Every structure is written in C-alpha cells, then in structure tokens.
C-alpha cells in the first residue's frame, strides 16, 4: 500500500526524475519491477528518466453542465418562490 502510494503520487509534478532515486524510493535496484512500473504505469523508460506526459481539461463544452445545473438550480429557486400550494 506504499508501493501503489508512490505509483499514485508519481503522476504529479515529478516532471522528470532520474531513475536511481526512483530505485531508492520505490524499491528493487535493477528489477523487473521497473518494467512493472514503467509499463503497467506510464512514465516512459527513456534515457535515465521517467518522462512526464501532459493532459488537459480545457473546460470547453461546459459552459453547459454549468448551464443545465443552473437550469436545475434556478428552476429550483423559481419553484420555491413559485409555491403557492
């Protein structure tokens, strides 16, 4: 549960890390567990470095889940102000 704890917190701002410090922290000096992490995980086994890929959200379409959750919420405001029985 610490092995997958490093394998969870790897994906953060370790934008590049040299391999033998990950050998120190993870465990197992030159294992096939480096194949396990570098293949079951991402962190492309390049030259002496687990490389960090990039991913984005953009908040593009939504704009609409804001608009429809506001449809829900203001239909609710109007609904409770609406009541009369």
């Amino acid at each position: 549960t610490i092995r997958d704890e490093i394998a969870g917190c790897i994906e953060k701002a370790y934008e590049k890390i040299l391999f033998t410090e990950a050998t120190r922290i993870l465990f197992f000096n030159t294992p096939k567990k480096m194949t396990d992490y570098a293949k079951k995980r991402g962190w492309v086994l390049g030259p002496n470095n687990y490389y960090s890929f990039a991913s984005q959200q953009q908040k593009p379409e939504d704009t609409t889940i804001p608009s429809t959750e506001l449809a829900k919420q203001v239909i609710e405001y109007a609904r409770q102000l609406e009541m009369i029985v």
């Binding site: 429809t68 449809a71 829900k72 239909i75 109007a78 009541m83």
Partner: protein
Amino acid sequence: RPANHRQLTFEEIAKSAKITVNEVELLVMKALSVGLVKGSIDEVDKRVHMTWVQPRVLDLQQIKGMKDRLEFWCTDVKSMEMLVEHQAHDILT
C-alpha cells in the same frame, strides 16, 4: 473545412493561390472590398480569421449532411426541452 476551427494562416493561401507573401493581403482585402468574405486579419502569424462562407449548391453529400446535422440539432433541442418541461411541469400544473 467544416467551419469550426477554420482560422486560416498565410501558408495555405500562398500554396493554393501560388502567390507570394506580400500579395495575400491584397488578395484578402480585395475579397473584403467585394464582400465575398466577412472576416478579419491578424498579422503576427498572418492568420486571416474566417467568419464567413459562400452559400453553395446542395449536392448529394450536402443533402445527406443537411438532413443528418439538422436532425442532430432537432433531437438535441427536443431532448433538452422535454427535460425542462418535465422538470418544471407539475408547478405549472
């Protein structure tokens, strides 16, 4: 290009029209003078921005894209309107 991410740069203009760099501005402002384009121009990248396309004769694939995208809009409007109506229907009553 399907009119969504269509901001054109200098290169494809100078590649299609096969004219040099300092003539594409004349080329686009001539069409802006005529009015068979309704866009605008940045020149840090020489991106000529597109807010326009010409109405063109409906072909068979244009027939199909017409019906398909028109239905695409119609069923979305219907499916959201039904949810609005049903969500606030019983307070109308």
